Design an enzyme around this catalytic site. Structure first.
Site, PDB file in Angstrom:
ATOM      1  N   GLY A 297       0.814  -1.205   0.000  1.00 56.70           N
ATOM      2  CA  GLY A 297       0.000   0.000   0.000  1.00 56.70           C
ATOM      3  C   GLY A 297       0.847   1.253   0.000  1.00 56.70           C
ATOM      4  O   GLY A 297       1.895   1.308   0.642  1.00 56.70           O
TER       5      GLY A 297
ATOM      6  N   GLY B  37      11.782   0.138   7.611  1.00 59.43           N
ATOM      7  CA  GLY B  37      10.390  -0.203   7.821  1.00 59.43           C
ATOM      8  C   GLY B  37       9.438   0.238   6.733  1.00 59.43           C
ATOM      9  O   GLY B  37       8.221   0.121   6.917  1.00 59.43           O
TER      10      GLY B  37
ATOM     11  N   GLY C 211       9.252  -1.058   3.639  1.00 60.60           N
ATOM     12  CA  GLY C 211       8.814  -2.172   2.819  1.00 60.60           C
ATOM     13  C   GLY C 211       9.675  -2.453   1.605  1.00 60.60           C
ATOM     14  O   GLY C 211       9.152  -2.748   0.527  1.00 60.60           O
TER      15      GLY C 211
ATOM     16  N   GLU D 261       7.374  24.420   6.030  1.00 59.59           N
ATOM     17  CA  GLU D 261       7.033  24.071   4.655  1.00 59.59           C
ATOM     18  C   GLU D 261       6.395  25.246   3.925  1.00 59.59           C
ATOM     19  O   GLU D 261       6.668  25.469   2.741  1.00 59.59           O
ATOM     20  CB  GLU D 261       6.105  22.857   4.637  1.00 59.59           C
ATOM     21  CG  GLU D 261       6.761  21.566   5.098  1.00 59.59           C
ATOM     22  CD  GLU D 261       8.152  21.378   4.523  1.00 59.59           C
ATOM     23  OE1 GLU D 261       8.294  21.405   3.283  1.00 59.59           O
ATOM     24  OE2 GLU D 261       9.105  21.202   5.312  1.00 59.59           O
TER      25      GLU D 261
HETATM   26  N1  LIG Z   1       3.434  -0.710   2.222  1.00 61.61           N
HETATM   27  C1  LIG Z   1       3.264  -1.707   3.095  1.00 61.61           C
HETATM   28  N2  LIG Z   1       2.103  -2.400   3.065  1.00 61.61           N
HETATM   29  C2  LIG Z   1       1.929  -3.398   3.935  1.00 61.61           C
HETATM   30  N3  LIG Z   1       2.763  -3.842   4.877  1.00 61.61           N
HETATM   31  C3  LIG Z   1       3.900  -3.140   4.885  1.00 61.61           C
HETATM   32  C4  LIG Z   1       4.227  -2.084   4.049  1.00 61.61           C
HETATM   33  N4  LIG Z   1       5.492  -1.598   4.343  1.00 61.61           N
HETATM   34  C5  LIG Z   1       5.895  -2.360   5.330  1.00 61.61           C
HETATM   35  N5  LIG Z   1       4.985  -3.310   5.711  1.00 61.61           N
HETATM   36  C6  LIG Z   1       5.152  -4.297   6.770  1.00 61.61           C
HETATM   37  O1  LIG Z   1       6.450  -4.098   7.279  1.00 61.61           O
HETATM   38  C7  LIG Z   1       6.987  -5.367   7.677  1.00 61.61           C
HETATM   39  C8  LIG Z   1       8.483  -5.222   7.600  1.00 61.61           C
HETATM   40  O2  LIG Z   1       8.790  -4.575   6.347  1.00 61.61           O
HETATM   41  P1  LIG Z   1      10.090  -4.939   5.527  1.00 61.61           P
HETATM   42  O3  LIG Z   1      10.574  -6.323   5.952  1.00 61.61           O
HETATM   43  O4  LIG Z   1       9.855  -4.791   4.077  1.00 61.61           O
HETATM   44  O5  LIG Z   1      11.158  -3.886   6.052  1.00 61.61           O
HETATM   45  P2  LIG Z   1      12.294  -2.970   5.417  1.00 61.61           P
HETATM   46  O6  LIG Z   1      11.744  -1.787   4.729  1.00 61.61           O
HETATM   47  O7  LIG Z   1      13.171  -3.874   4.553  1.00 61.61           O
HETATM   48  O8  LIG Z   1      13.144  -2.584   6.704  1.00 61.61           O
HETATM   49  P3  LIG Z   1      14.666  -2.443   7.164  1.00 61.61           P
HETATM   50  O9  LIG Z   1      15.304  -1.261   6.520  1.00 61.61           O
HETATM   51  O10 LIG Z   1      14.597  -2.348   8.688  1.00 61.61           O
HETATM   52  O11 LIG Z   1      15.307  -3.779   6.777  1.00 61.61           O
HETATM   53  C9  LIG Z   1       6.500  -6.296   6.576  1.00 61.61           C
HETATM   54  O12 LIG Z   1       6.237  -7.535   7.223  1.00 61.61           O
HETATM   55  C10 LIG Z   1       5.123  -5.724   6.206  1.00 61.61           C
HETATM   56  O13 LIG Z   1       4.181  -6.407   7.021  1.00 61.61           O
END
Ligand SMILES: Nc1ncnc2c1ncn2[C@@H]1O[C@H](COP(=O)(O)OP(=O)(O)OP(=O)(O)O)[C@@H](O)[C@H]1O
Ligand SMILES: Nc1ncnc2c1ncn2[C@@H]1O[C@H](COP(=O)(O)OP(=O)(O)OP(=O)(O)O)[C@@H](O)[C@H]1O
Ligand SMILES: [Mg+2]
Ligand SMILES: [Mg+2]
Ligand SMILES: [Zn+2]
Ligand SMILES: [Zn+2]
Lengths: 396, 396
Positions: free
Chosen positions: A9, A49, A51, A250
């Site tokens: 999302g 975090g 995604g 801003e």
């Molecule tokens: N856009 C999104 N839609 C739904 N769930 C999401 C979204 N973004 C993150 N999440 C949730 O975040 C959880 C962890 O995200 P993710 O493993 O992709 O982390 P990351 O961005 O790689 O973080 P890091 O930099 O700490 O490694 C996923 O299990 C998912 O449930």
């Protein structure tokens, strides 16, 4: 577990770029017959975090192909890299993923990766992906042509994006009739996809501790207070007091750039950062983006860049972390202007000081228009093209 | 012997958090039907003798389930860990307790524990608990998500808590009519639950040495003098002279934070420490807890953190151990302010010195209000929300 683009999302722009990769992976023959050359590597950059790993997994989910991955935090290293690429060649279309590439790009492991990138044939349908949240500390050898020469930015969600993520994680949970997911979204500015997922789990625990079989609106509101404080806290949100300071910062950029004759048009104002510059990334790119260098357009650019810092001093008498980066960028722009437009440190100091005074006088005047924009920004959180054009015309 | 929550005193906040674990252990089905996910491990932290093992035993007492436990001081080690987890799986709802986990988290024993945590199913009704009094020396691998990601703090008792513990250990002993348990509680500041239990045994020995069949008030008062001195001493208490220094230190924090415009509200003042920060624990958490970084709010935070040290120097010309930790925390906050807000060691030294002078001038002024608060704190030992709000309004 297998995931697709339906589990993501608020990443429309990033998803748009990744559609071509899926088409290439599904049928490489359609690209080869017209001489289209695909990049060898792709890099994902964004705050933790947001995604980045989820998008990499969804890309493999959409196109039914194998998925070989390794993590840079686990780093024998040279032999592990050799195995990964050999496995991917035995299967024609495949994906190689390297998570946390900043932790590995010790010298022998990096050398093996460079040899592997140059040793495989792109026309077989093989792509390499990587992710990081510290793009400015990567070794310059990784960004040369023919190896990791494409970047995509992943941004934090906005109000509409937060509401979509909440619906994804509550589709298999029983909810009551008084739950309003739009009200919950309005009360969590600054949250990311990882924080919203953890919030839903806390609300379910509050209902199970009482033996109920449905989550109510009261459970959600109590969960917010529990995740932002205590010996075990997970999330940070923007308080009402901090929101006023950010709104003025801003709005200062937009007011100053609308007055200077050489200023650039303004298309969007928001409380959440969107661009890669707004996220603090340089991406190894030159600051100057114009073919011609003239004095009049460079001075106007400097004045508009100091507008956010001028609004904080005149209204609050304070200074934030964002205003400190703006002054640092302006100092390096004025340094190139002295050498190209004709003791040196004393001349650079005078140019920056003159522009700061110019911005402050513009803020003192038009102070009535600045206040009006802040009030609208505090109730909608974002204004964009069509609605913004009308507002900017009524004022000024 | 079996114990329940009726054998614990002065741990209301800790007991509140542990109620959910009992509900989960009594019927896991109610949590699974709505997709509520429980933590795999829980960690208890606190000073020695505060009752960490007693709470773990009471949790198993309240929910009639088996109790498998091991001690970290007894550490063949890898095989012992395997046996413990295999036994817990044969019984559906169970508890695994690991006491003194800091003594084991030699490399092979720790590796086996990590494998066991990831190998059992939480939906069967299995939970793992641990306790320690040195949380800041634990291996970082134990605190990662999915393994020991929840912490609870156990605090020393206050006046009302001490009186409740005395009643628990005298419910099966004959007492005279002149015994006043509230007067005894007022005369043992600094005692923990382990010291109060030992005090009751000494009073009974003094009555049996004379052949009497009832414990009198005189026996209790003589017991206090015997346990704090001699070749075999067990307890330490706060003397009247040390109480005045502590009262001034605590009152200094509240006075300074009430004057600075950006200071935080004060809700409670006491002679006994309550929070995890007041106990000297960092808990592997970042010091900064705000979304926005501004100069004005950071300087006020530094000044209020040095208020306790400023009161000792101006009134007594001394310095204690608590004031030494405050200056250490302030030095690291000023180090992050230089890098984020714009030779480096010389700039950090100047920021701390300026804030210290600011706090001392505030102490010299308002010195009459500081004295008034100390007098009330020396006769009640604690002031909290409603009564504290009125007092702070009459002053200032
Ligand atoms: N856009 C999104 N839609 C739904 N769930 C999401 C979204 N973004 C993150 N999440 C949730 O975040 C959880 C962890 O995200 P993710 O493993 O992709 O982390 P990351 O961005 O790689 O973080 P890091 O930099 O700490 O490694 C996923 O299990 C998912 O449930
Ligand atoms: N709140 C309390 N109420 C009643 N008795 C208590 C309380 N706290 C401690 N005690 C007494 O303290 C005795 C020892 O406490 P416990 O075994 O729980 O120590 P602990 O906190 O684990 O200590 P350590 O860190 O030294 O291992 C218990 O037998 C109990 O009698
Ligand atoms: Mg990741
Ligand atoms: Mg113990
Ligand atoms: Zn700015
Ligand atoms: Zn202090």
């Amino acid at each position: 577990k297998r995931v697709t683009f339906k589990d993501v999302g608020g990443a429309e722009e990033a998803i748009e770029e990744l559609k071509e990769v899926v088409e290439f992976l599904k049928d490489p023959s359609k690209f080869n017959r017209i001489g289209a050359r695909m990049p060898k590597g792709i890099l994902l950059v964004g705050p933790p975090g947001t995604g980045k790993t989820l998008l990499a997994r969804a890309v493999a989910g959409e196109a039914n192909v194998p998925f070989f991955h390794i993590s840079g935090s686990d780093f024998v290293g040279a032999a592990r890299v050799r195995d990964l690429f050999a496995q991917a060649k035995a299967h024609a279309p495949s994906i190689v993923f390297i998570d946390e590439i900043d932790a590995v790009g010790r010298e022998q492991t990096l050398n093996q990766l460079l040899v592997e990138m140059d040793g495989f044939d792109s026309k077989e349908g093989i792509i390499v992906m990587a992710a990081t949240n510290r793009p400015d500390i990567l070794d310059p050898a990784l960004l040369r042509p023919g190896r990791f020469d494409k970047k995509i930015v992943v941004d934090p969600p906005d109000m509409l994006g937060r509401k979509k993520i909440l619906e994804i994680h509550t589709r298999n949970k029983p909810l009551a009739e008084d739950v309003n997911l739009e009200i919950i979204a309005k009360r969590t500015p600054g949250f990311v996809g990882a924080d919203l997922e953890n919030l839903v789990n806390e609300a379910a625990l509050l209902a199970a501790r009482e033996g109920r079989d449905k989550i109510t609106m009261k459970d959600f509101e109590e969960a917010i207070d529990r995740v932002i404080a205590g010996p075990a806290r997970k999330s940070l949100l923007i308080s009402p007091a901090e929101k006023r300071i950010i709104a003025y910062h801003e709005a200062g950029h937009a007011v100053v750039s609308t007055v200077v004759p050489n200023g650039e048009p303004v298309h969007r104002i928001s409380i959440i950062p969107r661009g890669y510059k707004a996220l603090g990334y340089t991406l190894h790119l030159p600051e100057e983006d114009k073919y011609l260098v003239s004095r009049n357009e460079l001075l106007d650019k400097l004045t508009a860049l100091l507008g956010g810092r001028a609004a904080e001093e005149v209204v609050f008498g304070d200074v934030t972390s964002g205003a400190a980066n703006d002054i640092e960028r302006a100092t390096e722009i004025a340094r190139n202007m002295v050498s190209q437009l004709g003791k040196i440190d004393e001349e650079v100091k005078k140019i920056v000081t003159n522009s700061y005074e110019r911005a402050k006088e513009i803020i003192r005047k038009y102070r009535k228009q600045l206040d009006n924009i802040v009030e609208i920004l505090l109730e909608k959180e974002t204004i964009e093209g069509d609605e913004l054009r009308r507002i900017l015309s009524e004022e000024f």
